[PDB]
Design a protein around this ligand. Structure first.
Ligand SMILES: [Cl-]
Ligand SMILES: [Cl-]
Ligand SMILES: [Cl-]
Ligand SMILES: [Cl-]
Length: 124
């Protein structure tokens, strides 16, 4: 079974680009990160910063998570992100995503020792 930290990395880290290159970024990344296996994952955010910088958010501003838990943290700085969301033309298989690039603060839930990101809560 994948660890929670490793699942966060696979679903939400893309340090190899500064920003979504094009409208097909999400179609490609959703497929390559194995987020379209049996179902199209409906919504997923990728963060274009170093893993270290994203991990560091777990020692930044403590904020409530949407679900009311208290282990969420909001990045002090904005980060380059791409939101991927399924379009109306999307029907498994042949998932289809809209790519939206933005520079926003991220909010992650953190857990463990080391205390690292395990869920992507939101961007602001
Ligand atoms: Cl793994
Ligand atoms: Cl791990
Ligand atoms: Cl997400
Ligand atoms: Cl990097």
């Amino acid at each position: 079974k994948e660890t929670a930290a490793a699942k966060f990395e696979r679903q939400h880290m893309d340090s190899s680009t500064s920003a979504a290159s094009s409208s097909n970024y999400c179609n490609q990344m959703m497929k390559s990160r194995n987020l379209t296996k049996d179902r199209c994952k409906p919504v997923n955010t990728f963060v274009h910063e170093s893993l270290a910088d994203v991990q560091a958010v777990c020692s930044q501003k403590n904020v409530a998570c949407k679900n009311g838990q208290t282990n969420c943290y909001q990045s002090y700085s904005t980060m380059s992100i791409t939101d991927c969301r399924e379009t109306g033309s999307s029907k498994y298989p042949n998932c289809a995503y809209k790519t939206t690039q933005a520079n926003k603060h991220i909010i992650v839930a953190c857990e463990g020792n080391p205390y690292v990101p395990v869920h992507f809560d939101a961007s602001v």
